[PDB]
């Protein structure tokens, strides 16, 4: 194949012009869809908070309209999924991974309406879920939509345009273009065979998507953490230890989310009426916790700067950790549309912060700031749970702009992803696709 | 297929423990080798200036001991290559790329001494070449060395251990772990078929190498540029245009580097004595320009902060650009051991800065800083010539720490890599492997 290679080497990086322009319009559409989705989620959270004001005297009526206002939106979201689009449940990254394997359909005429309005209800009701779940699946289907509409043919166009939409979808959820592309390259591409995904086209779509976000979001950053301290070489061993803690919790946490998928299914059996009513209690719990303990609910982006600034007591951090583990499993394992990605950043931040508070008092000669361990732990659950460490590290980097911590961030991620392997854990997204593909055969 | 897939998913990310520990020792050795390599270059550059002081009175003897001291070191490097390790010439990235394709041998018993000491002569004499060339090849061979010593078998260990050594070698040349790993993923892995390169092992080897670098290099950064301004949305179109200029210049520059390899070959025919004497003249030219106009010589890292702060006049910048285009081709195309990667960073910075000075005067309503285009152009030749845009962006980011420019950096890189394609260019490293493998069947 030496002569074969010479032909391929000389023909490298010749993506068809048709794919490039179509990736441009995909990114433009995915950005707008992600912007509109976020504006919708925020607008519903306002009304819910503004409604609690009109009833701030009758505290029982207060706690009641908190539960009900969120249960309705939650139920509305569950119903739209069970009735019209079952593969819009949970995150949606496993489905997009399947679609790239050519093993799951992109029913875009169904998912785009369902997932969009479904997420608005679950996310807008204050459930512990992330926008990236929705926006990645929405962006993937949108890439399929322009493939069908414009009838472009070939394996390249089918895999490329699906990939750029999914990358543009993650970028627009975090304002993180570099992390968007790494997600496709490291986690979502078919892991066991070659593919024709054009990287240059994924770039175009991520640019257009990122520009669309900046037109409607500039001057305000998702996570502002300031400039933290640096990391001396004699401190690195402390970050390796933090990763080893994440390496044992990662798989343990993956078991629970999978295990609770099963247990909550026992509750409703699969019945569209019992199921939607089950999601109404979880969604009402969150809108209630959203008032009586905000840090136990929501995506968790608000508590990340607070935790990194050492503004939480050790007690609260342990409290917040348990609470948010519970509310995250209950919400994600229940089947609501929405990601588990963003809530896992909050868990890593909180857990990291606690480790730093202990380390600060054990080693005063190191002159530590607990915040640096919060930043190193932020992307460590990602590395331990979904096993995409290169995506988490550069994603966290893009959101906190503290490059001087690249070495402890990288060491913490390796300790997590090494100890998850050696303790027999699986990549969560790969383990969900696996179970989906195993029931779509055991039905024969 | 759906049967096979479910089995593969449940067994994903289970790198053999034997491969992981060996990747750790690979990075540890590559870091020390790359550290020692840079210390060697600096020690030799020291002597050259201290010699010019003892002879700073006889300006004619001054200019001569500058030429002679550098010609000898250059000749020593050219000689070591032609005599004992012919595939240790030039960059070495095409050689390691071939090895991952299983189409080129890793003669580590030959290359490690040759490339190491060969580079000391070429790099230490002040030639326009980068440290990354050596350290990637040196780092790849070192990964092969521990595969052989410990007799590990399989395609995985052979492809992995070779890959982590090359990534660990790039990290240690730039203090850039993220750029090291991305380079394997985007440019150097076999581009047309699946491979068993384990990413987790490349990580371990990159860490250990970077830790080794930080132990002997802390508190001082390769390139310190400070915090530049941000880039407003209505200014972005200026960065797309800058990439478009890089997109047409990229292939034109690829022609010259390939073309001057041919033209310089006519001079010596292939004879180790005419060749070494030619390399002695190119290595001597640089040691002269290195004193009478330093920005025309060297890797170019020193002129990047000066250029980025707008401290050069427009007149000087164009000179530097032209001069450094000449000395870069003459040095890399001659076959000397050393990279062309870093000198292309200086070319992008210089070119961007000049473009920025025009933008400052054409659009005063934008309140621009020329430095922001220098940062966006720094990795733009990388995007147009070697066609590794994701690696250039993250490498420049890691060395300049100006993340607020990520969007203009990406727009400049895309314009470059889009217009290089549409003007009929090829990835240089892939095109050098192509010409190398085409002589191996004729």
């Amino acid at each position, epitope marked *: 194949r030496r002569r074969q290679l010479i032909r391929q080497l000389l023909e490298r990086d010749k993506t068809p012009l048709a794919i490039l322009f179509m990736a441009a319009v995909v990114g433009t559409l995915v950005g707008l869809a992600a912007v509109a989705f976020d504006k919708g989620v925020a607008w519903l959270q306002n009304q819910r908070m503004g409604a609690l004001v009109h009833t701030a005297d009758n505290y029982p009526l207060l706690l009641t309209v908190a539960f009900l206002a969120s249960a309705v939106l939650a139920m509305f979201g569950y119903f739209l999924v069970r009735k019209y689009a079952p593969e819009a449940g949970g995150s949606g990254i496993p489905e997009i991974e399947g679609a790239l394997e050519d093993q799951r359909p992109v029913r875009w005429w169904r998912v785009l309406p369902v997932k969009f309005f479904g997420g608005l209800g679950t996310l807008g009701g204050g459930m512990v879920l992330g926008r990236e779940g929705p926006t990645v699946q929405i962006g993937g289907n949108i890439g399929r939509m322009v493939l069908d509409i414009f009838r472009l043919k070939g394996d390249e166009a089918r895999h490329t345009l699906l990939a750029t939409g999914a990358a543009a979808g993650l970028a627009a959820a975090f304002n993180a273009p570099a992390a968007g592309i790494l997600f496709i390259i490291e986690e979502m591409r078919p892991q066991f065979r070659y593919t024709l995904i054009s990287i240059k086209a994924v770039f175009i779509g991520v640019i257009m998507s990122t520009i669309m976000y900046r037109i409607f979001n500039h001057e305000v950053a998702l996570i502002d953490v300031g400039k933290l301290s640096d990391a*001396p*070489l*004699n*401190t690195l061993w402390l970050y390796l230890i933090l990763g080893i803690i994440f390496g044992i919790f990662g798989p343990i946490f993956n078991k629970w989310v999978l295990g609770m998928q099963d247990l909550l299914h026992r509750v409703h059996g699969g019945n569209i009426t019992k199921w939607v009513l089950m999601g109404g209690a979880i969604g009402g719990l969150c809108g209630l916790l959203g008032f009586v303990a905000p840090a136990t609910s929501g995506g968790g982006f608000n508590l990340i700067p607070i935790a990194t600034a050492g503004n939480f007591s050790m007690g609260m951090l342990v409290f917040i950790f348990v609470a948010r583990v519970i509310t995250t499993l209950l919400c994600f394992s229940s089947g609501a549309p929405g990601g588990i990605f963003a809530p896992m950043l909050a868990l890593g931040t909180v857990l990291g912060t606690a480790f730093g508070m202990v380390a*600060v008092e054990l080693f005063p*000669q*190191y002159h530590l*700031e607990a915040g640096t361990f919060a930043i190193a732990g932020m992307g460590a659950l990602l590395a331990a749970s979904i096993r995409a460490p290169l995506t988490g590290i550069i994603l966290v980097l893009e959101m906190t702009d503290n490059y001087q911590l690249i070495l402890p961030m990288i060491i913490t991620g390796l300790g997590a992803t090494l100890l998850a392997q050696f303790t027999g854990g699986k990549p969560l997204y790969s383990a969900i696709l696996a179970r989906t593909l195993a029931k779509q055969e055991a039905e024969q | 297929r759906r049967r096979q897939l479910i089995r593969q998913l449940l067994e994903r990310d289970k790198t053999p423990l034997a491969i992981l520990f060996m990747a750790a020792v690979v990075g540890t050795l590559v870091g020390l080798a790359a550290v020692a390599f840079d210390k060697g270059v600096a020690w030799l550059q020291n002597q050259r200036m201290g010699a010019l002081v003892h002879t700073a009175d006889n300006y004619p003897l001054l200019l001569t001991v500058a030429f002679l001291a550098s010609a000898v070191l250059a000749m020593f490097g050219y000689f070591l290559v032609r005599k004992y390790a012919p595939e240790a010439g030039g960059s070495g990235i095409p050689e390691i790329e071939g090895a991952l394709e299983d189409q080129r041998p890793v003669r580590w018993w030959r290359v490690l001494p040759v490339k190491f000491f060969g580079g000391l002569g070429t790099l230490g004499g002040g030639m326009v070449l980068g440290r990354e060339g050596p350290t990637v090849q040196i780092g790849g061979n070192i990964g092969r060395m521990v595969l052989d010593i410990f007799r590990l078998k399989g395609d995985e260990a052979r492809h992995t251990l070779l890959a982590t050594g090359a990534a660990a070698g790039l990290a240690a040349a730039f203090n850039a772990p993220a750029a090291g790993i991305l380079f394997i993923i985007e440019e150097m892995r076999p581009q047309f078929r699946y491979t068993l390169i384990s990413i987790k092992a490349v990580f371990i080897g990159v860490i250990m190498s970077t830790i080794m670098y930080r*132990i002997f290099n802390h508190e001082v950064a390769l390139i310190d540029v400070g915090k530049l301004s941000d880039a407003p949305l209505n200014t972005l179109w200026l960065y797309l245009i800058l990439g478009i200029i890089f997109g047409i210049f990229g292939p034109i520059f690829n022609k010259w580097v390939l073309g001057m390899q041919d033209l310089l070959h006519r001079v010596h025919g292939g004879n180790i004595t005419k060749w070494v004497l030619m390399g002695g003249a190119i290595g001597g030219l640089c040691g002269l320009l290195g004193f009478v106009a330093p920005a025309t010589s060297g890797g170019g890292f020193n002129l990047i902060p000066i250029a980025t702060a707008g401290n050069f006049s427009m007149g000087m910048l164009v000179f530097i650009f032209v001069a450094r285009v000449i000395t870069t081709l003459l040095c890399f195309s001659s076959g000397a051991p050393g990279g062309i990667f870093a000198p292309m960073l200086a070319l992008g910075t210089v070119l961007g800065t000049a473009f920025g000075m025009v933008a400052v005067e054409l659009f005063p309503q934008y309140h621009l800083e020329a430095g922001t285009f220098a940062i966006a152009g720094m990795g733009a030749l990388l995007a147009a010539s070697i066609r590794a845009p994701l690696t250039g962006i993250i490498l420049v980011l890691e060395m300049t720490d100006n993340y607020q420019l990520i969007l203009p950096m990406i727009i400049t890189g895309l314009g470059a890599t889009l217009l290089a394609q549409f003007t009929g260019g090829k990835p240089l490293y892939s095109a050098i492997l192509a010409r190398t493998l085409a002589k191996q069947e004729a």
Partner: antibody
Amino acid sequence: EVRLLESGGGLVQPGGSLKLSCAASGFDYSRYWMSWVRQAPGKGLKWIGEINPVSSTINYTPSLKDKFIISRDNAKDTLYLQISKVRSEDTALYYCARLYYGYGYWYFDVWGAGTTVTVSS
Amino acid sequence: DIVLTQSPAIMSAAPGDKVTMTCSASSSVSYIHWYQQKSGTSPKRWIYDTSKLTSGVPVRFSGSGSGTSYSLTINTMEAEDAATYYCQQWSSHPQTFGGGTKLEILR
């Protein structure tokens, strides 16, 4: 240059109290930890305390409760040290210092000239 | 705390001669720093991390040590080298200095 210029020392009666001021110039006074060290007449150096750039953590030598009180005014670019219930043992030359590190084992980077504090009736 | 007992409290040496002063600890210490004091002048950081010199320190100085017996050495002493040298450690907390070593010209 880098200049630490400390002041506020002189003569105080026992049981009294003083407040020393150290004036930084020539660098970004934030981002750095500052420290105080004193040297008794004809003796060696002794560490008082340290403070981080955001005053979130302030360590002191093992010596008495509200004895020493260190604080910083990053806007003023100034470091402070209060001594209360001053005995004759607090008669010493008081050093302002900026902290840093290499491998991570911290040292006293740049010192000030000093301020003398005499405690006598 | 960690008592750092510098050994030669006072010592004399003529220029062009080799001087070696010491530093001993009651518990193990890592990477000791050394400061030079001229009377009437602030202390200057001279040697950090056992062995590394500071920008400006002539290379005739050299530090070494391990565990509990670090040292400072001047191969060929000079006149501008007369001063006081304190060994300081911050491997444990709180940090501790030494009593000091006075070094005077001999004539």
